[PDB]
Amino acid sequence: IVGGYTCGANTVPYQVSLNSGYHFCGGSLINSQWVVSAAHCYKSGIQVRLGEDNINVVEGNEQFISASKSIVHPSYNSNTLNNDIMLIKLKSAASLNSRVASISLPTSCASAGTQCLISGWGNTKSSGTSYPDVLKCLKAPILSDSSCKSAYPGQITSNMFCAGYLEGGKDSCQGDSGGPVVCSGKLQGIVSWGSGCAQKNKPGVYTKVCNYVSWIKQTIASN
Ligand SMILES: [Ca+2]
């Protein structure tokens, strides 16, 4: 996250860190046994780390639970990042409390102008590299589909939305991938891609979670 703020320990209780010996992606806890992330975060040997603030220090609220199964969206295209969404099943259920909590799926798609909270442990610089140990937060609006298409001609599908600031300076970034975009207490987006980070006229592009609810629910019900 570039140009965000320190969230505060366990203020984003649905935020997960995906760990394969190191933090490589974010994710969202959507019930006691399932995590949603980006399909581009797929790898085998995932440990899900819940209740994290400082990902380098054991602070006492963590749950570390292995993934039993990963399910990449059947139509995920790694070239276009269309349908950039994956489900991860935990080997056992997370213990839910005020610091580890599921985020609701949306019943409606969020409109342009909706303010959202994006969170992650990604790079905090637009040029060069500085990875924070503690969770960073950013409040950002959803941009009009027309702004979004103007910024990224020929790359935005109906399964993507833009959020952020066309002036630049405030964005998600590498290592925020797979993390949440929450608007009015509902998971609306997954941190998917962008051209660099926090560049002028190049906002963040997010997987449009409202399009995937039936797929998420039917997948969870049978696995
Ligand atoms: Ca920790």
Numbering used by the authors: 24 to 246
Give verbatim excerpts from the published study on this entry.
In this paper, we report the development of an in situ diffraction measurement system using crystallization plates at SPring-8, which is combined with compound dispensing using an acoustic liquid handler. In the experiment, we obtained small-wedge diffraction data from crystals of trypsin in complex with the compounds introduced by the acoustic liquid handler. The resolution of the crystal structures of these complexes was 1.38–1.77 Å.
The following compounds were used: benzamidine, 4-methoxybenzamidine, 4-bromobenzamidine, serotonin, 5-methoxytryptamine, 5-chlorotryptamine and tryptamine. In order to form ligand-bound trypsin crystals, the compounds in DMSO at a volume of 50 nl were introduced into a 500 nl crystallization drop and data were collected after overnight soaking. In situ diffraction measurements of trypsin crystals into which the compounds had been introduced by the acoustic liquid handler were carried out by collecting 10° data from each of 18–24 crystals, processing each wedge independently and merging the data. The results showed that the overall completeness of the data was 91.4–99.5%.
